[PDB]
């Protein structure tokens, strides 16, 4: 799974995200949207955004960013014993928002992109390794809840 070591590496980086959750949150959405624009159409609420600047000015794009990462950090914190935190997520995304898993891959990549950007120092070869596996765990588990809800896969 993740070694005990791999978890503490994960939890160390995340201590960085927790000093600025709304700020990290906002960049990962803009990352996502400007990297894979199609993702944007999934948000009624942000489809009105026509540029990065308009994305950076958006107070609600910021609040939503804080919501994604607060919720991803309560999961990460469980260090793979996240069953109760993941279900509802998998429920809304699968049954209400209709998010394909590949989209989950997309945001995973934007999240590494943001850490790599803001914390090169704090995010070396090992923290990179740790985080990428913490996210693939998260993706795998979403995927499988998907599959059980009889959704797309
Ligand atoms: C790290 C992965 C993600 C996490 C933790 C996350 C978290 C959430 C949370 C906590 C909410 C509010 C409660 C709910 O409706 O579930 C939400 C809503 C939403 N999510 Fe996600 N999300 C993730 C990935 C995605 C992706 C990739 C997309 C689209 C490509 C997306 C689309 C949506 C939409 C369309 C909504 C409703 C937005 C709103 O009106 O608040 N989510 N998400």
From Swiss-Prot:
GO CC annotation terms, alphabetical: sarcoplasm
Location in or out of the cell: Cytoplasm, Sarcoplasm
Residues recorded with modification Phosphothreonine: 67
EC number: 1.7.-.-, 1.11.1.-
UniProt subunit comment: Monomeric.
The name this protein goes by in its record: Myoglobin
Domain of life: Eukaryota
Gene Ontology molecular-function annotations: heme binding; metal ion binding; nitrite reductase activity; oxygen binding; oxygen carrier activity; peroxidase activity
């Amino acid at each position: 799974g993740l070694s005990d070591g791999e978890w503490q590496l994960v939890l160390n980086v995340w201590g960085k995200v927790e000093a600025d959750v709304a700020g990290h949150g906002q960049e990962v959405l803009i990352r996502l949207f400007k990297g894979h624009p199609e993702t944007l159409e999934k948000f009624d609420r942000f489809k009105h955004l026509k540029s990065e600047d308009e994305m950076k000015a958006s107070e609600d794009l910021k609040k939503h960013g804080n919501t994604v990462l607060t919720a991803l950090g309560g999961i990460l914190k469980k260090k793979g014993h996240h069953e109760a935190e993941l279900t509802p997520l998998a429920q809304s995304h699968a049954t209400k928002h209709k998010i394909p898993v590949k989209y989950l891959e997309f945001i995973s990549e934007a999240i590494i992109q943001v850490l790599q950007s803001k914390h090169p120092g704090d995010f070396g070869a090992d923290a990179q390794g740790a985080m990428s596996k913490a996210l693939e765990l998260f993706r795998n588990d979403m995927a499988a809840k998907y599959k059980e809800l009889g959704f797309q896969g």
